[PDB]
């Protein structure tokens, strides 16, 4: 979905308000390759710790789902940058998935990842998004076979996405070996989530292979800080990242 030697920002849904959400997405459109905007869940287990202090942030300020959508359509306006909306499934199941999609493409969102998509959902759930026009994106952690990173990879139309939740400060080995593992057996472009810190690893990771990288955490942290006033932080961290 994004160009080769893409950075993706990640940015919570609502952290701490969904104008400062899209306030930090108009900032940072300049050197996105794409964007993965996360909706918010109680019980945000499959997360880092700081990524998950900012779901109980968003929540706990009031953030409600559809203003996500609210926050894909402003954006929309000012940009066509693609945005993957990351997505716990329960709201997605209570709201009903293919109204869910259909209401997720009309705003403006090109694909979804939803983190704990259930197996037995699968088939059904990617017919739907192909259905309503929506791209999909799996996730695999340094856990995930090489069996199953090719069934991953035949169901994905978006781009495989590969985590680590070890955090790090170095990238850890076995998030390397799932890259490396991945680039083997994946068609679709992978990005990584191995929680980035240093322009070291952003370097280092497209060096080896990754189509993206995908910058959360480290965004977020300067966000649980500086609140609404993140904005020029963020700009900074980022040309950090990109040794500009």
Same mark, same amino acid.
């Given at each position: 979905?994004?160009?080769?030697? #893409?950075?993706?920002?990640? =940015? +919570?849904?609502?952290?701490?308000?969904?104008?400062? +959400?899209? /306030?930090?997405?108009?900032?940072?459109?300049?050197?996105?390759?794409?964007?993965?905007?996360?909706?918010? @869940?109680?019980?945000?287990?499959?997360?880092?710790?700081?990524?998950?202090? #900012?779901?109980?942030?968003? =929540?706990? &300020?009031?953030? *409600? =789902?559809?203003?996500?959508?609210?926050?894909?359509?402003? @954006?929309?306006?000012? #940009?066509?940058?693609?945005?993957?909306?990351?997505?716990?499934? /329960?709201?997605?199941? %209570?709201?009903?998935?293919? &109204?869910? !999609?259909?209401?997720?493409?009309?705003?403006?969102?090109?694909?979804?990842?939803?983190?704990?998509?259930?197996?037995?959902?699968? *088939?059904?759930? +990617?017919?739907?998004?192909?259905?309503?026009?929506?791209?999909?994106?799996?996730?695999?952690?340094? /856990?995930?076979?090489?069996? %199953?990173?090719?069934?991953?990879?035949?169901? +994905?139309?978006?781009?495989?996405?590969?985590?680590? !939740?070890?955090?790090?400060?170095?990238?850890?080995?076995?998030?390397?070996?799932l890259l490396r593992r991945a680039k083997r057996i994946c068609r679709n472009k992978v990005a990584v989530?191995?929680?980035?810190?240093? %322009?070291?690893?952003?370097? #280092?990771?497209?060096?080896?292979?990754? &189509?993206?990288?995908?910058?959360?955490?480290?965004?977020?942290?300067?966000?649980?800080?500086?609140?609404?006033?993140?904005?020029?932080?963020?700009?900074?961290?980022?040309?950090?990242?990109?040794?500009?």
């Amino acid at each position: 979905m994004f160009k080769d030697g #893409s950075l993706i920002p990640y =940015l +919570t849904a609502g952290d701490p308000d969904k104008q400062s +959400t899209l /306030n930090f997405l108009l900032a940072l459109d300049e050197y996105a390759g794409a964007i993965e905007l996360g909706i918010p @869940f109680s019980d945000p287990i499959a997360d880092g710790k700081t990524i998950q202090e #900012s779901h109980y942030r968003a =929540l706990k &300020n009031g953030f *409600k =789902l559809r203003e996500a959508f609210w926050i894909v359509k402003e @954006f929309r306006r000012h #940009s066509s940058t693609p945005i993957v909306l990351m997505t716990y499934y /329960n709201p997605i199941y %209570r709201a009903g998935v293919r &109204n869910f !999609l259909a209401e997720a493409k009309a705003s403006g969102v090109a694909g979804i990842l939803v983190v704990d998509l259930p197996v037995f959902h699968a *088939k059904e759930f +990617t017919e739907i998004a192909r259905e309503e026009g929506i791209k999909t994106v799996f996730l695999a952690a340094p /856990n995930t076979p090489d069996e %199953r990173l090719k069934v991953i990879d035949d169901m +994905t139309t978006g781009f495989v996405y590969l985590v680590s !939740l070890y955090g790090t400060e170095e990238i850890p080995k076995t998030a390397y070996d799932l890259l490396r593992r991945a680039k083997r057996i994946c068609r679709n472009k992978v990005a990584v989530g191995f929680g980035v810190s240093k %322009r070291e690893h952003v370097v #280092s990771l497209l060096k080896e292979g990754a &189509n993206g990288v995908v910058v959360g955490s480290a965004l977020v942290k300067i966000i649980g800080e500086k609140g609404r006033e993140a904005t020029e932080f963020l700009k900074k961290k980022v040309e950090e990242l990109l040794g500009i």
